[PDB]
C-alpha cells in the first residue's frame, strides 16, 4: 500500500467486520491494482459493510 490514500483505505477495509473474506480480499486487491480508485473502493466497501448488516438481520 504505497501511498497515504491506499494505506488509509486498507486499514478501514481490514476493520469492516460484516464483509466476508472474499469481499474484503477483493477490495484490497482493487486498492493495489487501481490506486486512483482508492476513494471509490473505500466508499463501495463502506456501503457493502452496511448492507451485509441487513443480510445478518435477515438470517
Amino acid at each position: 500500500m504505497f501511498n497515504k490514500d491506499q494505506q488509509s483505505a486498507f486499514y478501514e477495509i481490514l476493520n469492516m467486520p460484516n464483509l466476508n473474506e472474499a469481499q474484503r480480499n477483493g477490495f484490497i486487491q482493487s486498492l493495489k491494482d487501481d490506486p486512483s480508485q482508492s476513494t471509490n473502493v473505500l466508499g463501495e466497501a463502506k456501503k457493502l459493510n452496511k448492507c451485509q448488516a441487513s443480510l445478518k438481520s435477515f438470517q
Binding site: 469481499q23 477483493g26 477490495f27 457493502l48 448492507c51 451485509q52 441487513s54 443480510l55 438481520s57 438470517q59
Partner: protein, 109 residues
C-alpha cells in the same frame, strides 16, 4: 411483511424479469434498498446494495433502482441458476431497524 413485493413469476431463459417492491416514506422513501438472493436450498446472500451497486462477484445482468416509495430489480438474460427467492431489504426510520419483503420467487421454465 412490512414491504410488499410483486408476485412470484415464471419466465423462459434469456427473458428480462422485473421484480418490484413498495414501502412507505419511513423506509424506501428515505433509505436505499438492498436485494437478497436465496438460491434453492441455500443461505441467502447479498445481490445488490444501496439501490444499484452489485455485490462483489454478482453478474451485471442484475440492475436495481429506487423511485419514491418503490424499488425494482431487473434480471436480463435470465438463466436457470437465477431461479431463487429474491428479498428486498431497507432501513425503516420509524422501526429504527431493518424491514424486509416477503420474497418473490423467479422460476426459470
Amino acid at each position: 411483511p412490512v414491504l410488499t413485493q410483486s408476485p412470484s413469476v415464471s419466465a423462459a431463459p434469456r427473458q428480462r424479469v422485473t421484480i418490484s417492491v413498495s414501502g412507505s416514506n419511513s423506509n424506501i422513501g428515505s433509505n436505499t434498498v438492498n436485494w437478497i438472493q436465496q438460491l434453492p436450498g441455500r443461505a441467502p446472500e447479498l445481490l445488490m446494495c444501496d439501490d444499484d451497486l452489485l455485490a462483489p462477484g454478482v453478474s451485471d445482468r442484475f440492475s436495481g433502482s429506487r423511485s419514491g416509495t418503490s424499488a425494482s430489480l431487473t434480471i436480463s438474460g435470465l438463466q436457470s441458476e437465477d431461479e431463487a427467492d429474491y428479498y428486498a431489504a431497507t432501513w425503516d426510520d420509524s422501526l429504527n431497524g431493518w424491514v424486509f419483503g416477503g420474497g418473490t420467487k423467479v422460476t426459470v421454465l
